[PDB]
């Protein structure tokens, strides 16, 4: 009986240690998910801001194109205003 | 009981054998979950510089993007200014 | 008292909604970690096979090349054996 | 209890408003949970053909890196066959 009573004691104290690893397995699982949605996440945000920068950047280009069509109108106009006054006193 | 007995020591042996190797396990476990948190944490750093990292580009080509528009208006500007010289500098042309 | 009533009944039916909700809220929580992780498992393992892979055909590059080595010598063995044969009848 | 009651009146009116409103968000979350699912359902299908392919692609490399080897030994020894010739066709010139 004394020998049956701590092999039953032991089969308890099995019993803690398999639980108290259950819950330590399933602690890792939620670290590692947690983990794995915060930066997925984040990842999303870049994405979102390297999308929004880029959209910006090829606008920008589009804008310094326009700026060249009109400036090169200018400096045309210069040119014709440059012959007017020049027929006048010629 | 003789024999109950060597079937009790050998469970007691068995008993042991696996409390002692679940106390390995959990200890693995809870390096596991360090390394996670250690190896999360950082990845997160880094990301969480990329972010301002792009934020700051960002700003400076809204910035950059702000500036461009005020000269394009400008060019505008003086362009029609030279859009009257030739209206008026023709006029005196056809007399 | 009647009022009163109802009015504590429906107190009651926001608690319900309320804590189904929020069960609800985790169980999307699980279900995108859950996911999340799935994959992320997968990701690794094509990982290691491109690597495996990538590994091997290197590898094949490499024996490639040693064959050519090796023919090399084994053409130009041909063409001695070529003078050899030339030089004893001649 | 005349007003009593118009506070009454008025918590019936925020309490039903706000349980309307919770079983909108739940209906909400309902979505959510089954775009989630069918989003990574789909997702885990894309990689695990993806892993099929390479599995396939790795098996064919791991065959030519059978057949490589083993031109590479019939080359060797037809080298050695002419090791041979060699050493005794000197012998024949050194007379």
Same mark, same amino acid.
Request: hydrophobic share 35%; net charge negative; glycine share 4%.
């Given at each position: ?5 701590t092999m039953?004691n032991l089969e308890?104290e099995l019993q803690?240690q398999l639980?108290?690893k ?23 945000? =870049? ?7 880029? $959209? ?12 060249? !069509? ?8 210069? $040119? ?11 | 009981?003789?024999?109950? =007995?060597?079937e009790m020591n050998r469970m007691i042996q068995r008993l042991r054998a696996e409390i002692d190797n679940v106390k390995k396990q959990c /200890?693995?476990?809870?390096?596991? !979950? ?12 880094? /990301? ?14 809204? $910035? ?22 030739? /209206? ?8």
């Open positions: 009986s004394e020998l049956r009573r039953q308890i803690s639980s108290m259950a819950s330590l397995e399933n602690s890792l699982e939620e670290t590692k998910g947690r983990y794995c949605m915060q930066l997925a996440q984040i990842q999303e945000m =870049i994405g979102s801001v390297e999308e929004q920068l880029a $959209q910006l950047r090829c606008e920008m280009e589009q804008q310094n194109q326009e700026y060249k !069509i009109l400036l090169d109108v200018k400096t045309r106009l210069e $040119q014709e205003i440059a012959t007017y006054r020049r027929l006048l006193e010629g | 009981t003789k024999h109950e =007995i060597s /200890a693995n476990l809870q390096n596991a !979950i360090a390394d996670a948190e250690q190896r999360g944490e950082l990845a997160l750093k880094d /990301a969480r510089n990329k972010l301002a990292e792009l934020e700051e580009a960002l700003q400076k080509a809204k $910035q950059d993007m702000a500036r461009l528009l005020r000269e394009y208006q400008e060019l505008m500007n003086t362009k029609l200014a030279l859009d009257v010289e030739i /209206a008026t500098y023709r006029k005196l042309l056809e007399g």
